[PDB]
Amino acid sequence: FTLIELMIVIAIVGILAAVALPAYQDYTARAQVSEAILLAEGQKSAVTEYYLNHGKWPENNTSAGVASSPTDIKGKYVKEVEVKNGVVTATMLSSGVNNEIKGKKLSLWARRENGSVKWFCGQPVTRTDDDTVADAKDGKEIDTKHLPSTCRDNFDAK
Amino acid sequence: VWVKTFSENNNAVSIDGSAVSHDEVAEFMRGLNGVVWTPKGMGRLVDRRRDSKTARVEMLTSDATIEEFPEAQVSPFFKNIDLQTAKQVGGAQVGVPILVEFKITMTSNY
């Protein structure tokens, strides 16, 4: 006979949350990844200096002169950050993150410019030789959709 | 009486036969069991019957997987699911059979 204004408006806010659910869920993940990136960076300094001073990429965190323990460079969504031959990889925690990005990671690596180096940011990579890395293809890479426009670099970016 | 095909699976026997009339097939069906069958499961053997891919006599309805409730019973040892089909085949001017072709499936005991 009457009461449909309360019933529809409680059910439009319900469906509004369902539509606002995936937007906040990738905005959210995309936010948790933007930090793995900040934690990865700022460690470029150590790595850059080590390379320019010695001409060899730092083998591990201790070589680079950073928390000798990967797990000591963690965060809220970051379970750690390891330096492996100049390549700095950031791992996403398992608690406090999206759902399709946890335990997932990215890498920052550089290239000899000769007198200086240039840095790249993208999906996990392994270093082959002092001037070559390759996709750490394995299935734990943070999905392209969660990576900034500034971190879409490919293993062979120059 | 004689019948046509017999194919088992150590839980049920799907048979294929024929009888003289609405009587000897009634005698035979009474000698076994009578059941209200309900949720049937479809399985690749049915389609292998529609495919002709498993040799038999496609006067027959298919199937051999379901769930059975007893209506009447004469052999304590046999759970006939139902007289799956029955069709009186007349023949032609080349010859008779005139009888009632039929098909039954039955799980025994144990």
Partner: protein
């Protein structure tokens, strides 16, 4: 992980065959699962087998688990031994890892 020296030449053969062959040569009794993989090609010279094995695993093939008497395995290229007379082998590891990359 120690054995007689051998030369492994396998031209398009089932890893299950290479395995059995490797058991018929007293390199344990090797047994696979059923469907491990398929067929592989390798050609080794002067390699102890237990190594040519570890090396076969990395090609395509499986990982190995040993019960003790029997071992279970579950789901040209060549091998050459380099003597290192002068340096320690571990000092090469940084540079050698760097050629491999993701290869």
């Amino acid at each position: 992980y120690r054995g007689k020296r051998v030369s492994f030449e396998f031209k398009d053969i089932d890893i299950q065959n290479l395995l059995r062959v490797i058991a018929e040569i007293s390199k344990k009794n090797i047994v696979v699962a059923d469907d491990v993989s398929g067929k592989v090609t390798i050609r080794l010279r002067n390699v102890p087998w237990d190594q040519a094995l570890d090396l076969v695993l990395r090609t395509k093939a499986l990982g190995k688990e040993e019960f003790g008497n029997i071992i279970r395995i579950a789901p040209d290229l060549m091998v050459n031994l380099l003597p290192v007379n002068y340096a320690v082998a571990a000092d090469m590891a940084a540079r050698v890892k760097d050629v491999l990359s993701e290869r």
